[PDB]
Every structure is written in structure tokens, then in C-alpha cells.
Ligand binder design. Structure first.
Ligand SMILES: O=[N+]([O-])c1ccccc1S[C@@H]1O[C@H](CO)[C@H](O)[C@H](O)[C@H]1O
Ligand SMILES: O=[N+]([O-])c1ccccc1S[C@@H]1O[C@H](CO)[C@H](O)[C@H](O)[C@H]1O
Lengths: 459, 459
């Protein structure tokens, strides 16, 4: 058996990585003002009044889109709570909605269970509403948040992610988050924590420093924990990470399907095209990250059908593209091969549990795929055995037609990270043989999957 | 050149045939009652109130579905008008919608023009609302409808289809429709008229007897005009038509993508599968007809995304399926060939103006396609030069692998009609040669297109 190299993912981190995609639902009182994305905590609760709320409709959207998990904003910075908390009146308890008899968080988790989706909770650390109170102190707010966190972590089923937005959260110190952390971990042991700034010792996943949907190239699962803390001074450390990082905290890539995070009818026309989403997929999931994609429910409490459709067509395109590994049926020759179990053909067998590996101390490998009939492809994907840490740190891919000269693929020359998944899109080539070059590493390669593909017409 | 055989289509009818698909939009006061598909004419106009009408979103759906034309229910039997007609109050003039200042028809035709789509109008002949007036007479109603007809044919741009539903229309006699017909024909020369019952002498296209999306096998473009008039006792005459029919009035197949024609949230889970739609396409467009598919807009004024997705996937499946004619590159030998101009190869050139033709007096033909590499297919399509009338009345398709034994394709033996397009799906076969057997007919064959194909995995 192989020994792990450097730092390793936890079981939670493995589970989160497997999700590949997660949905954000930015929904609340901001939705009921005119073009507001950051509420001041002064809006009247009365204006909250979705006219046809149906979280099952949201799940339908995720189902068609292939998205196994969702995160709802139970409370944004504006302070308005989407469940009838016992610790505040600034909530659905006093909305016009259902005569103050409603609970959105309840309808969200219920629908999640009905559809077999993983439920996550966004609970805004910085709270503009509480700051309005003349009795506000960090110490008091700590206890307030704890209680709410307690409710959401206890009365609402299993919670797979808790999100801690860093905006306006600088005042919050590390022991505050420690109190909150104890509550989450104790009550929801499987819960992944997106943690920012002073929450850094508790974060299972990290921000990657932008909202364009673009993780770093490269993007290591590892980085220094202080990069999470001193955010505005470590862009590269959040976005690219660090191979010699003192912590295994992989990056989560958050992006909205619309220009804003909250819903605004004026943006019905600026919903991201299927192609844009494919790009963002390739610069997130295909960059050793996870794509957290936002769909804002409207004033009916529903996902706009353009948002749904585009996401669904993304799914369809991804399914076409990766439906056939064009490398299959190849004769496979490789230097540095550990054994029969670890044979390079395991990169093509579609088993979750098999992989190609090298010999101890040997970090390089050359693997040739000779194809029965020449193929055309404009896309490739590679996956590492992430339980064994970041092993390979430099890789390239070449192909050939004649069999004489090798041709470098520009977009796939001298790549560094592999991680959970790396995807490269390229100017379409025709090839009879494909060469996978493992050029460097901290250890011998462990590679689950390698494939080349033809991108779907949908894209 | 060749001379037509029997009755031929008209320029309008040619244009209509080449649309292949048309969209229906059932939308009006019904949409805002609870679970109503046939309005009684007593609903208050006030309840008509789409929260955010967006006809551009409808057009985008059509674009995604590959649908070049749309027909809107400007007025259903309930009698509520979607444009501010000068001749009634039972209209958008007195809706909650936009404080009575809206015009759905205007937004519709404006969106059509913007996206380059052909606009058509459904104007209900039977009007339950008008019937409620103590002053109702057929003769008064005839003038009322004529006034509305003149508005819609004059102020709303080029109209490509007028639809005359026959439900409850029996008290309307031919001179009534004649007066209606002159307005349409004069103001809109290119406008196709869907005619039922006593409108029979004015119909450009006929109904085909059901709302399940199945034209007949066979389905002749021709039939006896009496079939249309006496609809209820001539099902085969509408559905299949008649080879010796007195008129050229091709069948238009209408079906809803939902169980109901109007929108109901309860049916969101009953939208037709991509495969059902593909069946329907094959039993409509694939049966010498045109498919009119209904997408009912909802209380917000949007097309539901499931509806969108399934249509968009059908379009995608059609495109993949027919993108490659597997017979191309064949050696082609045929009996009964008119000349080099009309060689059997013309069936394979993907050109609009060419076709294979037989010789005068000879109605039989045999065309053998010899393929370089043995192929696999499960679908075929054939298209006649309909400008020259229905010429072939019996055809079959055979294959072979070794070359010694011709093998019949059960699904494609002794077919009768060809017309505009005929499509046959079959259990997958492998073949080195394919035989097209033109076995009988009224005149020498004239064929634009023959082809075999592999159905999309989408199906
Ligand atoms: O506060 N900002 O102006 C800002 C601009 C662009 C992107 C993010 C921010 S705040 C940032 O949001 C992240 C999630 O997208 C994390 O919550 C960070 O901790 C927070 O600082
Ligand atoms: O009146 N019906 O009960 C009825 C049931 C099933 C299918 C049609 C009808 S009415 C029929 O609709 C056709 C279009 O789908 C045409 O408008 C016919 O003229 C009308 O009679």
C-alpha cells in the first residue's frame, strides 16, 4: 500500500469534494426591496411576503441540474431571520407572509429531505440589525448568535454545511468563533464549515478570494491558515493556495448565476449563458475546487425559469461531454508502474476505487495510450487519489498522428496541480496516440482517472 | 420538366409545411382561475393579472426548441380579449394588469418580430361571453367578430396564421366565415387559415381528428372538403385524409406539452417526456403533417422551465439524429431514372432544389445504395417533391450485409404516403447495402430526400 504525502483531507473534506457542485439560495427581506443586495437592517419585517413560495420547485431545479446539496441564507447581514427564532422579532414571525406563521428554513430542509439533497445553512456573522440596538456588544452578540446557531443546528435535521461570510466580520475574534464552532461540531459532526478571517482554525473549507467563479491555476488544497485570517494580504494564498501550506483547507468557489446575489427582475436578461457556466465549471470543479452556484428565489419565492433551464442544460452538456472516455480500448504502456493492481489501465476502468500508481521514490512517469482508431478531442480530465495528498506537481499531455513526432498540447503543458479533479479544454486535435507525462512530484503518482473527451454541442 | 399529379399545394401551404413545428400559447383569463381550461365568460376581467409578463422569454424558448412560428390565443371561448379592442369591454382594458393599460397581443407580436419568428392568431369563433348578451344574434356576432378580426389583421404586423377552433362553432354558417375569410385574405395574403367545420371552403390546413399528436398512417395532404365540415363523422377522412380527396388541405397536428391546454401548477409534474415528444414528432412532422405544440404561460407570464428543457432537448435530439445521413458516400444504382439532372444521388446531396425523378408513365423504381463501410441505423426518413402532388403510394426499404439475401425492415414495408416528410423508426440493423423500393403510385416518383440515421441517445 502507498503512504500519504504531506497533508491529507478529512472525511468531511472528502465528502464535500465529492459533491462537486452546491447551490446557494440568497433569499430574504432584501428580495422585497427595490434592487437591494445589502440590507441595512431597517426594513420593516412586514414587507417580507413571497406570493407562491415552493422549495420543492427549488429542489426540482437542482435535480435537473445535477446538484446534490444546497445552502440557504437563514439570515444575511441585514439580520432578518427566515425561521421563527425565539431570540428575535426581526424575522418571519412578524412578516406579512402567512400571517407571521411561516418558517422558510423548515420548508427548505423538508424539501431537501424529500429530494434527498444535503441541506446547508448560511448564518451571517456580521449583523447590521443587532448593531442597531443601543445595548449591542460583541459579547452579547456572541450569545445571541450561539442560540440561533443552536436552533438551526438542533431543530432542522442534519446539516452538511455552515457558511461564515467574512464581510463586516473583522470585529469578531477567534474565541467568538470557537464558541460557535463547538456548537456546530458537537451537534452536527458531518457539517462542513466554510470559514473566513478570524474563524481560520475552524474552517473545513476556504474562500478563494474572488466571486468571478475563478479558482487559481494552480489551486492547491493546502495553504497557510494565516492566509484565511489576513485575507486582503493573501490573495494568491486563498486563490492558488500553497503546496507547502501548513493546513489542508481546500477552496470553495462561490458565484452567482446573475450579476447580483439577490433576485432582481432587471437582471432577468443577465442570467449567465450555458457557455459561461461551462467556463466557470472548468475554472472551479475543473481546478481542484467546488462550485457553489447561487440561484436567487424571486418575490414569489421561486427560481426564475431562465436560471433553471440554463443550469439544466449545463448538466446535459457535462453529461454528453464526459459520457465516453475516448481513450478506452487503448493499449497502454507505462514507465514507473507499481504493480498489476496499480496498472496504468486503471486510469480508464471507471472504477471509483482503482488507480494507477508509481514506485516509491520515483516521482516521474510516462504513459502512452495507443488507440485502435484515431480520434478527435478538445477536452481532457485527470483525477488524483486525494486521500494520498498532493503527489504530482508537474504534468503535460502530448499526442501524435503519424507516430513519428510528438506534439505538445499548449493548454496542457507544464500544468502543476491535479488534486480532486483537473479539466483542460483545448483546440480540437486528431490523435492516434496520447502521451501522459508526469514530470515532477513530492511523491510517486496516484491517479484515479485520466481521459480525453469531445465537448458537447450544447457548449 | 415534370408535371404535377392531381392536386398541388399553394405557396402559403408550402411555407406552412416548411415550418415543421409551430408553438401554441394558451393564455388568458382562464390562467387566473383555479384549474379552468374552458371559461364560462363570467369571470371578472379584474382577475387577469400576470405579475411580470415576458413574451421575450417565450421567444427564447422557441429559439431553444428550434420553433420558427407561434400562435397566441387572442381570445378563447370565454371571450376575454388580450388586446384593448374598441368593440368590447371584456378585455385587458378592464384587467388589474397594468391598470387596464396593457396589450398582450402587442407584446407578443413585438417579441415575435424581435426574434424573427412568425406570429399567428387564434381568435375564438364560439364566444360564450357574447352569447350571454340578451341582444345576441349570429348576424350581430358576425359583425362583432369581423370588427375584432380587422383590428388584429391590421394593427399588429404580418400575421402568418389564423386559427378557427370548431368547438361550439356549429351555429356558424359558411357565409359567416366567408365574410371573415375576405378580411383575412385581403389584409394578410400570406396568412394560413386553420379551418374547421362550416369554414371548410376557406381552410388552408385541416384538423386531423385528435389532440394526442397522431396524424394518420397514411396521412394524405388531400381529402374531401366535406370531411372538414362533417368533422364528427369523418375521423379517418381528417386523420388519414383521402388519396382521391377533392381538395388539397393538409393536416395540422395539435397537442399540448401538458395534460391541459391552459397552465396549472399541478401539471408541472405531468409535462411530456423528451421521448413522448419525439414519438409525437414522429407521428406528426414524421407523418406528412405539421406539429402545433402548446406551451401554456403561467400566472407570472413565463414559460415553465420543464416545458423549456424538454422542448430544447427534443431539438437537440433531432439535430444529433439527423446531422449525418449514413447513406452518404454510397455507390448508387437505380432503375427508372429520368436523367442526370434527376439522378438517385440527388436524394443524398442535402440540397434544396434537387431530387430524383422517374420517367413519365413509370411509377415503379428501385434504388440500391452500396456502402463503403457497413453501417448501423435505427431510423429512416424520406421526402417527396410535394409541389408535384402525391406521386408515390407504396414504398418499402430493405437491407443486406452479405449481399445474397435482401432483408425486409418490418416497420418500413408497404408504407403508402410520403408527402412532405415521412419518418420511420426501427429496431437497430447493420447493413452494407440498402434498397429503396418505390412499388406503386399515380405518377413517376419525385424524391428530394432519402436517408438513414442513428437516433440520438437523448431519446
Ligand atoms: O466585502 N467585499 O467588498 C467583497 C467584495 C468582493 C468579494 C467579496 C467581498 S467580501 C468576501 O466575500 C467572501 C465570499 O464571497 C467571503 O465571505 C470573504 O470572507 C468576504 O470578505
Ligand atoms: O369538443 N371536444 O370535446 C373535443 C374533444 C377532443 C378534441 C377536440 C374537441 S373540439 C375540436 O378541437 C379541434 C382542435 O383540437 C378543432 O378545433 C375541432 O374543430 C374541434 O371540434
Amino acid at each position: 500500500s502507498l503512504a500519504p504525502c504531506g497533508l491529507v483531507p478529512s472525511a468531511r473534506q472528502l465528502e464535500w469534494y465529492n459533491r462537486e457542485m452546491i447551490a446557494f439560495f440568497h433569499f430574504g427581506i432584501n428580495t422585497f426591496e427595490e434592487y437591494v443586495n445589502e440590507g441595512d437592517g431597517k426594513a420593516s419585517t412586514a414587507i417580507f411576503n413571497p406570493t407562491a413560495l415552493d422549495c420543492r420547485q427549488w429542489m426540482q431545479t437542482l435535480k435537473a441540474a445535477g446538484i446534490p446539496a444546497a445552502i440557504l441564507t437563514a439570515k444575511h447581514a441585514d439580520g432578518f431571520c427566515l425561521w421563527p427564532s425565539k431570540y428575535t422579532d426581526y424575522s418571519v414571525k412578524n412578516a406579512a407572509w402567512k400571517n407571521g406563521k411561516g418558517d422558510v428554513v423548515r420548508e427548505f430542509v423538508d424539501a431537501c429531505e424529500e429530494y434527498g439533497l444535503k441541506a446547508g445553512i448560511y448564518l451571517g456573522p456580521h449583523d447590521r440589525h443587532e448593531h442597531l440596538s443601543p445595548l449591542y456588544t460583541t459579547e452579547r452578540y456572541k450569545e445571541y448568535y450561539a442560540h440561533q446557531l443552536g436552533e438551526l443546528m438542533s431543530d432542522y435535521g442534519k446539516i452538511w454545511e455552515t457558511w461564515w461570510d467574512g464581510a463586516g466580520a473583522d470585529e469578531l475574534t477567534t474565541p467568538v468563533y470557537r464558541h460557535w464552532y463547538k456548537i456546530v461540531r458537537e451537534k452536527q459532526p458531518d457539517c462542513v464549515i466554510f470559514g473566513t478571517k478570524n474563524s481560520y482554525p475552524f474552517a473545513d473549507v476556504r474562500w478563494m478570494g474572488n466571486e468571478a467563479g475563478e479558482a487559481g491555476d494552480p489551486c492547491w488544497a493546502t495553504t497557510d491558515s494565516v492566509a484565511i485570517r489576513d485575507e486582503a494580504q493573501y490573495y494568491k494564498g486563498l486563490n492558488e493556495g500553497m503546496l507547502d501550506g501548513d493546513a489542508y483547507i481546500p477552496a470553495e468557489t462561490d458565484v452567482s448565476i446573475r450579476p447580483s446575489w439577490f433576485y432582481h427582475a432587471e437582471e432577468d436578461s443577465r442570467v449567465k449563458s450555458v457557455r459561461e457556466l461551462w467556463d466557470i465549471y472548468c475554472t472551479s470543479v475543473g481546478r481542484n475546487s467546488v462550485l457553489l452556484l447561487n440561484f436567487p428565489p424571486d418575490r414569489r419565492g421561486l427560481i426564475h425559469s431562465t436560471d433553471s433551464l440554463h443550469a439544466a442544460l449545463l448538466k446535459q452538456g457535462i453529461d454528453e461531454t464526459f459520457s465516453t472516455n475516448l481513450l478506452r480500448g487503448a493499449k497502454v504502456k507505462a514507465t514507473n508502474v507499481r504493480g498489476a493492481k496499480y496498472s496504468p489501465e486503471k486510469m480508464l476502468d471507471n472504477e471509483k476505487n482503482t488507480y494507477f500508481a508509481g514506485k516509491d521514490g520515483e516521482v516521474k512517469a510516462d504513459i502512452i495510450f495507443t488507440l485502435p482508431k484515431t480520434i478527435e478531442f478538445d477536452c481532457l480530465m485527470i483525477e488524483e487519489v486525494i486521500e494520498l495528498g498532493h503527489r504530482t506537481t508537474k504534468w503535460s499531455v502530448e499526442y501524435t498522428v503519424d507516430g513519428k513526432n510528438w506534439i505538445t498540447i499548449p493548454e496542457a503543458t507544464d500544468k502543476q496541480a491535479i488534486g480532486h479533479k483537473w479539466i483542460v479544454r483545448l483546440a480540437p486535435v486528431k490523435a492516434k496516440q496520447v502521451r501522459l507525462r508526469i514530470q515532477d512530484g513530492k511523491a510517486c503518482p496516484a491517479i484515479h482517472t485520466f481521459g480525453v473527451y469531445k465537448q458537447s454541442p450544447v457548449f
